[model samples]
Each structure stands twice: as C-alpha cells, then as structure tokens.
Target chain A: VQIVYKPVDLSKVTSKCGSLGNIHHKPGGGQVEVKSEKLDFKDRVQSKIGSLDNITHVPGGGNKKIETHKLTF
Target chain B: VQIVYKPVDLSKVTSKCGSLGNIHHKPGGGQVEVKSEKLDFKDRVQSKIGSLDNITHVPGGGNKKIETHKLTF
Candidate 1:
C-alpha cells in the first residue's frame, strides 16, 4: 500500500492543511483490485500513531493569508 | 512536505514492512533546494502519531517466507 500526502484546500477543511490520497494496493495473486477512497486524516492518525497532537498550524506571515500547517510526524 | 510509503526490504529491518520517503518541499520564494534523505520509520511514527503500537505484522501464508506488515494508522 502507498500513502500520498498533499496540500489541502483551506476553504474546505479549515483545520486540515494536508490530505491523504486513497490507499493503493499492489496487484498480485487472488487479490482483486479495490476501489480507492480518501482516508480520514484524524481517524488514520489516531489509530496508527495513537493521537492527533502532532498536527499543528500557524497563520501565514505578513501579506500571505494561507495558514501554514505542519505535521511533525 | 510529501510523505511517500512503500514496501521495505524485510532483510534489513525484519520488523518493518514499509518505508517513508524523504520529505519533499514545493519550490518557490527563497527556499533553496535541500537534499532529500530517507526518514526513520519508528521515529517519524512515534513523533507524528504518538506510538508504534499500531505497527503489526503477520507471516506470509504457506510457501511465502516474507512477513506481511500492517500499519493500522
């Protein structure tokens, strides 16, 4: 499986600055191709890493309006 | 930063099944090109998510000698 992370639209999720792409499975054996879907950020983080405390954000400096989201993990 | 996950060589780290690629930064402004490097699995997981308990593995079935590692996070 592969995990892809990219910048998220701030208008959609105000608190989330990054998004995870659908999980991709390598083709092989009897495993049928499965449809991909976006994985929930908080859900995955909570389950795998144990908490969501590492996700933080800061307002963009000066004239920039976009908030800077930082994922320390 | 972009996080890429892929299958890891089991011979190197027997307990780890996946690896995260170097963090990639989008180019712009005064940001200089920084050299990319492989990220430590346990360190990143522990820092970002909080713990490594969700990393689990199972032996491949039947004739397969490889172990299947699962990251629930």
Candidate 2:
C-alpha cells in the first residue's frame, strides 16, 4: 500500500484544514506533506501493510472512505 | 494556503460540529464566515482556495458541494 497526502484548498472533505491531506493506499496513492521531520519510518512500516492499520486520519470533520487497490504498475 | 472558518451544520464529515471551513490555497476559491472581529490581517492573512481544496466546505454534514459559482459577475 502506498500512503500519501494531497493538500486541498477547502474545508470540504478534500480540503480538511490541510490535515487529512488525502491519504491513499495504492502504489501511487496521493501525496502527504511532511508536517514534522520527526516522523519515524521504521515505526509505522508494519502498520502500512495492514498489521496495525495505517491511520487514515481526518482533520476533525472530514469523512473517511477506505478502498483497497492492488496494482501491477 | 487559504484559511477559512465556514460554518457547517453536520456531525459526520463536513458538518463536523461546526469546526472547519473551506480552506483554499488560491484566490477566492470559497466563502468564509468571519466569526470574530478580533481577527487581524497580520495574523493569518486568511483566505480560501483549491479543489477538494476549493473548500467546498460541507456545512457540518447537513450541507455541502458547490454548483452555484453562486457569487460571481
């Protein structure tokens, strides 16, 4: 699964206070802006594979819809 | 980035107990309700813009999405 954040320009689900960032689980999902340099990669690698569930965070009021995509590219 | 505080009337998604507004990263991508008279221009330079970002800002959950272009010349 590929996790990423895509920043939006509204408070709508797509824009979420710039918080949710549009997280995707595909190989080339979306994009995530690194808010902090302190993010630890090794710590969350397991969760990415569904071991602990990669958090699809919402910036407070945004809705969440999860989809699993297995791509070959 | 545009920061706004559009009021929503929902609990699920956009509505969000009245928390977020559409935040656009462009020029006048959305409309925001200014709640406080104390907001200073030097503070956030507050504005709204984008796509998922254009801050379609769901009014809480009770309302959202835009088709109006509602306010334009």
Candidate 3:
C-alpha cells in the first residue's frame, strides 16, 4: 500500500479541534485532516475510523452512511 | 473524488472491538477497519483519526509517526 499526506488549508475547511490539528472536514468532501508534524497520520485516521463507527447510533442522522476507500494506481 | 469499499476477511485481520466491528489492524500493513454495515466507514475513520492524535503522546511510542495518503488514479 502506498501512503502519503497532503496538507489542507484550514481556512477553507471545517475542522474539529482534537489534541492534534483537528479532524478537518472538507466542505466539498473527504476524510479528516491531521495538520501536525508531531502526529501519526495513519493512526489518527485509524482511531477516528473507530469512533465514527459508534456515532452511527443516531438513527437517520445525516452523518450516517459514510464509507472509506483504498486506491492503487 | 471517487469513494468505494472493499470487504476484508476478519479471520486474517487483527482489529479492535468498538461499538461496531473492531478496527481491524491488518498485520504487517495498515488501517483500523469497521466491518459493519451499521457504521459509517468514513466517520469511523475520522474519529480514529482524532484519537490517534492523542495517542501520540507516548514520547517516541511505536504507534507514533503514522501517515495517510490520497491516491487519485
């Protein structure tokens, strides 16, 4: 698997203030962002992945029906 | 941007037990997996992302220094 990181413009994105740079939500779409060099991007994503699973309890919540993808080119 | 899902074999996977399916940590590789239709895969990833940030405080923890990527093919 190929791993990489792309920094986002916090000004253009909506984010949550976590211990790190905040789980950023791109207005157009996509995953959360970890904008700190001190953080492990993959683990951050992994933990967030776990938490989102619990948030699904809200019946009919707009945040339901989320999915993830892995692409190989 | 394109999004998709690929199912995994839990038997061969090492994962965590959350409210949903454990975040399957595929040995020798990546990601915490949510193998439940009841969970929002993306959000799960997001929350995990947030949590990983906090976990980075072990001061040179083996779990630190993880990174993520976006591959558009």
Candidates 1 and 3 compared by lDDT, better number: 3
Q: Give candidate 3's error at residue B47 in angstroms.
A: 7.8
Kindly list the interface RMSD, in angstroms, of each predicted candidate in the order they appear. Answer: 27.3, 23.7, 23.1
lDDT of 2 by residue, A1-73 (tens): 3432232243234333433334333222233221222222332132111111122222444454332223122
Off by over 4 Å in 1: A10-64, B5-73
TM-score, model 3 to reference: 0.13
Alpha carbon lDDT of residue B2, candidate 2? 31
| Model 2 chain A worst lDDT run, 10 consecutive residues | A46-55
Error of 1 at A22 (Å): 55
Q: Which one is best on TM-score?
A: 2
Number of the top-ranking candidate, with DockQ as the measure:
3
Worst 10 residues of 1 chain A by lDDT: A54-63
How well is each residue in B1-73 modelled by candidate 2, as lDDT tens digits?
3323233333222433434433333222222222222222232243321112222232343333432111111
Please identify model 3 stretches exceeding 4 Å from their true place.
Answer: A1-73, B1-29, B40-54, B58-73
